[PDB]
Design a protein around this nucleic acid. Structure first.
Ligand SMILES: Nc1ncnc2c1ncn2[C@@H]1O[C@H](COP(=O)(O)OP(=O)(O)O)[C@@H](O)[C@H]1O
Ligand SMILES: Nc1ncnc2c1ncn2[C@@H]1O[C@H](COP(=O)(O)OP(=O)(O)O)[C@@H](O)[C@H]1O
Ligand SMILES: Nc1ncnc2c1ncn2[C@@H]1O[C@H](COP(=O)(O)OP(=O)(O)O)[C@@H](O)[C@H]1O
Lengths: 257, 257, 120
DNA sequence: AAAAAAAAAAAAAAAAAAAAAAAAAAAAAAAAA
DNA sequence: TTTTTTTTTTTTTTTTTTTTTTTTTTTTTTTTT
């Protein structure tokens, strides 16, 4: 069944180029060449993790000689209430280096060693709100001991937590802020996203004022909502024999959430 | 004594089908196939818990091969003031895997491991109100990390707690409601209940208005209350040498409860 | 330099099929089907190590099922004076499972678990 | 001058981070036959 | 040419101390029209 193949294909995830993504990539590349630490602030379901992650694929570490890998960008997602030891362990795990059983001071020394051996000019920390207040001192300690840029990606809680300590705030003053979709930006994004993700036999008439209206009402500018809504509508539309997404199907999916 | 066997039958619990149960089962099957998080909210004594139990029994784990048995659906019942560590322990023990000792980080790692190895399509959490606010920060983390359709089940209090965090509410936007029985639905439920759950030999027509008024006034549309009343009336009537429910016995029971 | 490229090729390692190796492979397949323990005794500098490694390459890990790797054949090289802890740990690490730091009893149970989950 | 449900100032429950002894058991090995 | 005693050498297994949050329950609300 061809429909089965399309269902399986849609149930996946794909990357669709966007302007804000390119802006973030260029800004972060500038910071990486300057070795200047910074932070990034945005709302949930805006796709900032996808931008931080898509950037790292381009700069994947490649080593041809017998010497160990030289990695320029390392990327870790801390768990809830991640402490100092837990964070160091993740840095070591990402570099495919054997964790040494021992104490926290041993973890600190080992982390400095593995980071000194490789490049690791830029470190992208996601979900920085979850980071425990005790650990930020270690983060900036690393940023000062070695010339490595540190990027703290978080929401408004990141702002709130950072502004409580003077040194951390001084270290991470420069920043980039994400926005939401609206107007022509939103319409162009919907058109581009459907052309990039949907290969349905017939057009969905997305440009129509009414479809844009209901998608705006259900989306509110959050790409993390538009992607899910349109993918579910597509799977359901194809499942009922409709090659294209239809107005009633859109209304149904929007009503469920 | 034949009456003793009948009494044993009446005291033991049984499961019957209802419109709400079938609706929930179809809805949850959809959510499980699409790997989407959702929640179930309704009043107490409406029987939604038994619906979850029946759904689990339908999807029995299958282990044809010598490898780890497939476990499609997981169902956990947290106790009062439940934390993250105990939640992880319950998930681990439900899958017949030993619980290694150590800090919470090890518990998170072990839980992710055992959930990856088995199928673990959808995870259902009964009486979700008992969980602490901090436990949701890990439930949602699992939902984002792996393709599991986490399902929260509880009362109206659940929404009041979920609204405290923007991200938790953003994750769960779909829901199904359970509610009271009334009118023709209530009358049909009573008539069906007399035939299946009760083991009385003759008569006991609860369709009539006189008995319906009693059961309606005492029950208030809650299915669990109805079950209690009918079983007790039948047992007491059998003890009194009666083979059919009589209005006087029905009246006597409800004023004690 | 072309000559240096040829030299770099000659300094490499190659594998050549011999009747000795094929005999060992057929024998090992028989023993695996029979699920019977056995042993191979052979002199030094005979290449039996390479033959066993090639056998391992014949059957690659089968990830075709959705949850575990289901690797049917494992191959470990113990160090000198290999203790029980190091043995269990090598077996565990070969299957991409983290080491549950503890006592040798914990390593024993953990190794049994990962050996049951995988084909082995 | 008489009446008011809402911020500060106080007790239990979990959770995590580090030395510091003590004994057993074995394995080799040098001297002595 | 093996045996006794030494000698070392791993190897393994077990007790005490401190700090930081979260959450909930009374008294105060003086301040306010
Ligand atoms: N550039 C993109 N292309 C395609 N899908 C995207 C993109 N950005 C975000 N998404 C959708 O949004 C989700 C990722 O958003 P998320 O990483 O949760 O945002 P954040 O982590 O910044 O809160 C994915 O499920 C994906 O489908
Ligand atoms: N389909 C059913 N068949 C038999 N008994 C039921 C059914 N649904 C509910 N009940 C009765 O109602 C009670 C169910 O309440 P419960 O499952 O605890 O719901 P809740 O969790 O909302 O309180 C049980 O005691 C059971 O006897
Ligand atoms: N079938 C073979 N193909 C290629 N080289 C071989 C083969 N058999 C032996 N060799 C050579 O012999 C060496 C392998 O010997 P080795 O594995 O050390 O034997 P063992 O360890 O059993 O003494 C390699 O350096 C390799 O070049």
């Amino acid at each position: 069944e061809w429909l089965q193949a399309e269902i399986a294909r849609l149930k996946g995830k794909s990357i669709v180029p966007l302007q804000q993504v390119k802006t973030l990539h260029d800004w972060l590349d500038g910071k990486r060449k300057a070795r200047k630490s910074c932070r990034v602030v945005g709302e949930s379901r805006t796709g900032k993790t996808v931008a931080c992650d898509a950037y790292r694929y381009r700069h994947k570490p490649q080593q041809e000689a017998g010497r160990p890998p030289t990695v320029p960008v390392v990327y870790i997602r801390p768990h809830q209430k991640c402490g100092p030891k837990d964070l160091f362990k993740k840095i070591t795990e990402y570099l495919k280096y054997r964790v040494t059983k021992g104490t926290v001071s041993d973890f600190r020394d080992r982390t400095i060693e593995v980071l000194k051996g490789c490049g690791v000019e830029m470190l992208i920390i996601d979900e920085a709100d979850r980071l425990k207040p005790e650990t930020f001192a270690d983060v900036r300690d690393i940023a000062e001991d070695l010339g490595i840029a540190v990027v703290l990606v978080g929401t408004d809680r990141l702002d709130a937590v950072i502004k409580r300590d003077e040194q951390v705030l001084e270290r991470f003053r420069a920043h980039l802020r994400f926005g939401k979709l609206s107007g022509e930006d939103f319409k162009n994004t919907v058109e581009m996203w459907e052309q990039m993700v949907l290969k349905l036999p017939v057009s969905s008439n997305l440009k129509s004022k009414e479809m844009l209206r209901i998608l705006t009402s259900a989306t509110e500018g959050y790409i993390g909502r538009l992607d899910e809504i349109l993918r579910e509508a597509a799977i359901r539309s194809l499942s009922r024999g409709l090659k294209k997404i239809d107005k009633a199907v859109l209304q149904e999916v929007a009503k469920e959430y």
